[PDB]
Amino acid sequence: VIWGTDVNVAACKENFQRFLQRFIDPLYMQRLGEINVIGEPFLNVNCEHIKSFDKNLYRQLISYPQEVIPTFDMAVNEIFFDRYPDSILEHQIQVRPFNALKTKNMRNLNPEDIDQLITISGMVIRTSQLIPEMQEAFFQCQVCAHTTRVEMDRGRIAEPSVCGRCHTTHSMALIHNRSLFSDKQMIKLQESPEDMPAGQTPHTVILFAHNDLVDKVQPGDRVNVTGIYRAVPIRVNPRVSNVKSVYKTHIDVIHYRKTKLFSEKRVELLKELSRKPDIYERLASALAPSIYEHEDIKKGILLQLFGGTRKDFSHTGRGKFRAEINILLCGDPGTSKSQLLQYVYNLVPRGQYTSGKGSSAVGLTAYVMKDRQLVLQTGALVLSDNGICCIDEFDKMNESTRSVLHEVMEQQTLSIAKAGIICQLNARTSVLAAANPIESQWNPKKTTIENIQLPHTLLSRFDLIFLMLDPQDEAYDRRLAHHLVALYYLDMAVLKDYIAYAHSTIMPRLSEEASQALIEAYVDMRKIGSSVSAYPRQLESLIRLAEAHAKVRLSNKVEAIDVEEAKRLHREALKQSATD
Amino acid sequence: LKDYALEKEKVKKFLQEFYQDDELGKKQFKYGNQLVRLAHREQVALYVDLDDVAEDDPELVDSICENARRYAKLFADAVQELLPQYKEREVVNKDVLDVYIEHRLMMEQRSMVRSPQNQYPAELMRRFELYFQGPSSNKPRVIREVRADSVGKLVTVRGIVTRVSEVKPKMVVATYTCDQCGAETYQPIQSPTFMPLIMCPSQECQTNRSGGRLYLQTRGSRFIKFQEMKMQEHSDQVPVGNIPRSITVLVEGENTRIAQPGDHVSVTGIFLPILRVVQGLLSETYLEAHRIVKMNLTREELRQIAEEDFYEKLAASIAPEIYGHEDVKKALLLLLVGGVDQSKIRGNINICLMGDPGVAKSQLLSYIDRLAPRSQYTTGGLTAAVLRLTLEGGALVLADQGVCCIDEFDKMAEADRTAIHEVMEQQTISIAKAGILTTLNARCSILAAANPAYGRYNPRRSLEQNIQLPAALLSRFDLLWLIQDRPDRDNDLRLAQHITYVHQHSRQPPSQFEPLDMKLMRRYIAMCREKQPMVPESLADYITAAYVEMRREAWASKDATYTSARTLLAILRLSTALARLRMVDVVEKEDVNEAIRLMEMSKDSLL
Numbered sequence A: 001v002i003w004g005t006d007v008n009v010a011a012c013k014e015n016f017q018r019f020l021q022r023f024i025d026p027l028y029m030q031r032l033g034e035i036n037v038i039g040e041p042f043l044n045v046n047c048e049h050i051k052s053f054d055k056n057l058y059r060q061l062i063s064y065p066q067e068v069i070p071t072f073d074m075a076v077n078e079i080f081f082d083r084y085p086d087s088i089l090e091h092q093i094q095v096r097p098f099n100a101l102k103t104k105n106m107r108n109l110n111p112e113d114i115d116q117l118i119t120i121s122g123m124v125i126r127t128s129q130l131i132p133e134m135q136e137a138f139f140q141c142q143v144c145a146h147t148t149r150v151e152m153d154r155g156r157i158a159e160p161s162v163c164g165r166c167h168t169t170h171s172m173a174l175i176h177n178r179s180l181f182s183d184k185q186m187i188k189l190q191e192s193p194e195d196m197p198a199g200q201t202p203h204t205v206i207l208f209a210h211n212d213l214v215d216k217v218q219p220g221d222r223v224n225v226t227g228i229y230r231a232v233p234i235r236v237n238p239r240v241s242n243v244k245s246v247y248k249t250h251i252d253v254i255h256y257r258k259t260k261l262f263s264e265k266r267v268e269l270l271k272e273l274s275r276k277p278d279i280y281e282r283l284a285s286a287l288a289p290s291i292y293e294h295e296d297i298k299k300g301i302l303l304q305l306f307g308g309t310r311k312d313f314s315h316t317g318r319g320k321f322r323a324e325i326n327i328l329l330c331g332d333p334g335t336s337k338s339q340l341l342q343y344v345y346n347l348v349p350r351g352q353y354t355s356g357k358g359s360s361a362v363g364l365t366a367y368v369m370k371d372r373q374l375v376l377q378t379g380a381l382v383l384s385d386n387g388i389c390c391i392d393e394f395d396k397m398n399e400s401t402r403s404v405l406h407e408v409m410e411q412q413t414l415s416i417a418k419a420g421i422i423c424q425l426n427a428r429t430s431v432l433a434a435a436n437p438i439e440s441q442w443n444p445k446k447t448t449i450e451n452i453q454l455p456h457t458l459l460s461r462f463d464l465i466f467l468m469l470d471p472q473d474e475a476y477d478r479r480l481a482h483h484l485v486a487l488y489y490l491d492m493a494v495l496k497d498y499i500a501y502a503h504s505t506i507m508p509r510l511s512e513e514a515s516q517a518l519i520e521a522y523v524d525m526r527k528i529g530s531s532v533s534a535y536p537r538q539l540e541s542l543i544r545l546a547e548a549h550a551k552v553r554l555s556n557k558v559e560a561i562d563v564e565e566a567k568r569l570h571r572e573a574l575k576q577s578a579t580d
Numbered sequence B: 001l002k003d004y005a006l007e008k009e010k011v012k013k014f015l016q017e018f019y020q021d022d023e024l025g026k027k028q029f030k031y032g033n034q035l036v037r038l039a040h041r042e043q044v045a046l047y048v049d050l051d052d053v054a055e056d057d058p059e060l061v062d063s064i065c066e067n068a069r070r071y072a073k074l075f076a077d078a079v080q081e082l083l084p085q086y087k088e089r090e091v092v093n094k095d096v097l098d099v100y101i102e103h104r105l106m107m108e109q110r111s112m113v114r115s116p117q118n119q120y121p122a123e124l125m126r127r128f129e130l131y132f133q134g135p136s137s138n139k140p141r142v143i144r145e146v147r148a149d150s151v152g153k154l155v156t157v158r159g160i161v162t163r164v165s166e167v168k169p170k171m172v173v174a175t176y177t178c179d180q181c182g183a184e185t186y187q188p189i190q191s192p193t194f195m196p197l198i199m200c201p202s203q204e205c206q207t208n209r210s211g212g213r214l215y216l217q218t219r220g221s222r223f224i225k226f227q228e229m230k231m232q233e234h235s236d237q238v239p240v241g242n243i244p245r246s247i248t249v250l251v252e253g254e255n256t257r258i259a260q261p262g263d264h265v266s267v268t269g270i271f272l273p274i275l276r277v278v279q280g281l282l283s284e285t286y287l288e289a290h291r292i293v294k295m296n297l298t299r300e301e302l303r304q305i306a307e308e309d310f311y312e313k314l315a316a317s318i319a320p321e322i323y324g325h326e327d328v329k330k331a332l333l334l335l336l337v338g339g340v341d342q343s344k345i346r347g348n349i350n351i352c353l354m355g356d357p358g359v360a361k362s363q364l365l366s367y368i369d370r371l372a373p374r375s376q377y378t379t380g381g382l383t384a385a386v387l388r389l390t391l392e393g394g395a396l397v398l399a400d401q402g403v404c405c406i407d408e409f410d411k412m413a414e415a416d417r418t419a420i421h422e423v424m425e426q427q428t429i430s431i432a433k434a435g436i437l438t439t440l441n442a443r444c445s446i447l448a449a450a451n452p453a454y455g456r457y458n459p460r461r462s463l464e465q466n467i468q469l470p471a472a473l474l475s476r477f478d479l480l481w482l483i484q485d486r487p488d489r490d491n492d493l494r495l496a497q498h499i500t501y502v503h504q505h506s507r508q509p510p511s512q513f514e515p516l517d518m519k520l521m522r523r524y525i526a527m528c529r530e531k532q533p534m535v536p537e538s539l540a541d542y543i544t545a546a547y548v549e550m551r552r553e554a555w556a557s558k559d560a561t562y563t564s565a566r567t568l569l570a571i572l573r574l575s576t577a578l579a580r581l582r583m584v585d586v587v588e589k590e591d592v593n594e595a596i597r598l599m600e601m602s603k604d605s606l607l
Ligand SMILES: Nc1ncnc2c1ncn2[C@@H]1O[C@H](COP(=O)(O)OP(=O)(O)OP(=O)(O)O)[C@@H](O)[C@H]1O
Pocket: A290, A291, A292, A293, A294, A331, A332, A333, A334, A335, A336, A337, A338, A339, A340, A436, A480, B472, B564, B565, B566
């Protein structure tokens, strides 16, 4: 056995071969046959399968990845030469295990894990161009051009300092092109914010992809990366050989996974509470309990949380459809706008909170900065590709950021001209903006555009503009005071689980009754506007809201009740920003 | 002067034969059970309480204090010898280091006189860590008192963490494998840096003179979690005319990730030098941490507390030399006593003082910084930072339930403004230097001072017109006081008389109540912090009535007076702070009325 382990090459290979052949959900042989035609020599294996089949083999694999993976490679190559014994491949099959030890508490990582295979979920923050690293340096004498080679000189290259044919002094210089290189890509990946319990200091890790699996993860992608934990010394000065007693650590990736829920009890419970006739109203009430007397705004933000159903219009040639719901809460200071924004950001997973001011710690834009490598840094919008971007103080923004917001709300993507290349980062986010009117208070008789001073197009992109004000009503003040004092002297968890289940499983689809109701409502709106009239964008908003409401009810199909609720909510928002 | 073998015998006897009756008087060997758990790999760190040692051998404790590293090693060796005896189950070989150790032991036992070098280092037979807890007899030592004389002695200090580095793996026993002999080489490491070995010292290669070149391997080697932090003198112990001093602390093992910046902690550890030459070598010192723990009168005194004017008296004691500003002083006292946070409610009472130059604002801020137990003073850094790779708490973090007095507020950077806005909204500071949003707990009352731009305040110009601060930011503050230096011959004459008396006697003019000594004020403040008064539902009716009345008045007022729910929250906070001052667990009509009066007086000060 290899020193300091429990590993036998022959026995380990035989056990891996047995696992490949004798298994029940055989998938490995199926994908071996698939690789035959495809030619893709990378056999991905879920380590949990080995754990179930043989826990001892799984433990052995985790403990000594570097020494065990080659045995699996050899076994797979022998099998491929057994099944389909005749075939052509530039390099024999390779195995890249994954999903083995979800020690995703990156903040909780220990030196005991050094040189052990581990899988961690997170969002890649930055990358770099593939680095060619030498593996067989080639040298030629300045005097006599005596060619020589130095192979795998343990990272560094051993300069001969003396020739071998004229045996002159140190005159043999390296020839870069004649040498041999391998691909090594560096990635900086941040720990997934959701998994962190406290998240006081999000953790970051460095990954190296070697000889393959390069450029397979773009910046901002949320993936599960499985690789070997590594610790390497850092020299105090390159000239001297002294090394720090504290090692810097990184990961050598082995596999990338781009990315049921709970148990039967949770699905049963959510279905049961869905059966309630007033589940919509009850869910609205549960959302943001601190707030008071706001119902239409709460229902709108809830529908935004659920959002419309994802739809594929690639065949139709109409381009991507904005299934997300964008809501702008416009109100005077002290109407609890920021409280709602924070609460929504504190509830939805993978949500992002930002301020319209350029001083915001996050920033609503992405840009290239020197490391001194000019690498891209993502913005809040790109960061929350499928989450919810709660923008506060949305009124105060620069024209460039306004154009960026218009672009992202229109095409669901952000165009960045890095160097000379234009990159379209997909950002299908749900924008929840909050705006406070200019001046101390909101001047009535002035349109929201006049009193907020934002482009008409940009606000027309929003599918719901909710106007909230502090009425000069003594009764309202008394009620609010009673509510606050009572707060002085349904848990969010179940709501979050319900939203997650709705997003994961259900996908509302239109219905003939719903179609006719939509058409009738739109023509009625048109007729009303015959005497800010109706626009087809309003129809898109209505259909999206109806789909979201159906998702809330878990109907899986848009229903006339959903159409009625969507129309009523849209009319309420219209009234809120209406004037005449 | 003493036989360390005898010391090893004594420590083994102590560990074997120490028992303190646990829950329900259960006679249990407190350290025997821990030894069992260590033998089963169920524990990693074994903290030893020097009080227990003092239970039967004060001399041993004194020797440990006089020399700590030696006795730490002695205890570690004793535990290493004892562990096999207490082992009872062949626990699953956790990690790879356990199996590696098992293989090494099997090979060694598969062997006789042998050279001292040709044996495994003790530190390689490990994964049990030892630490000491300082005796109750030894009082905590101020950082300034820890000098070169105490180097090598176990000491307990108390301070505030100012920065902590990320956990990293530090090598303890480097392991190398030769190229020819197939043996193994080991290298204990104590220095922060080391020279990796090159040619193996193996007997086989030496005899065969093969010149086998060693290759370092991480799997064989042994690492330990490591963190470098800086602990600063807590403001209570700092001399009046000095500044806090800092001590570097090297946390390792299980002690890692047990402290955060701004934490008021107590550290027991060994004070040792690090040599990273006038009449001898010169070295920098540090503190090898062992235990880190995050910390949180006469009858006449009570009679004075019972006095109705008591509170007023305390107001008179807030910077007595500052003539006038009585209500401002009262508000400052309310800030000092803070809220209650009954559950949770933000208990910090943020106050801002906007005024023309030369109205004692800075002096007031300085006095508050001197009186508040935990205090920070700044002018506009304030927020945390990421130094180069370590978090460094700013003044706001250093407050951490204290009070941050920010003079010259109007000259603060916009980013700092946003930061303080976040501090007043969530009591947390979000900072990102490398695209990482780190959130730190900064829960601290804020006392800001600002000056109107372009000279003295112009009454004819509305707020934010004579000042260059966002209106919303001002509305965040619970109390906003405008101080105007209106020339009034009577009042000006009074002030002049006061100043002249001060200059002629180095003391303020005599008053009705003599100002109380700062220490007594602090004591009373803490006593008030003890209470957490409630708000009876009955009082709610009156509070709501008052709120609706004042809001109606604001609507009647042509100029908006920032009235909102924030105002009601502030009213409640002030009422509960006054209740704390009264030492009564139930608010009273009196307190509510007084809070309302203060709020009205602020808004009038904006007149
Ligand atoms: N209708 C309401 N129901 C419940 N609470 C309310 C209501 N209106 C205001 N509040 C309370 O008033 C305070 C408003 O604070 P917040 O900072 O969220 O206000 P905002 O209107 O978003 O402010 P701004 O626009 O100045 O940023 C919070 O305590 C909020 O709970």
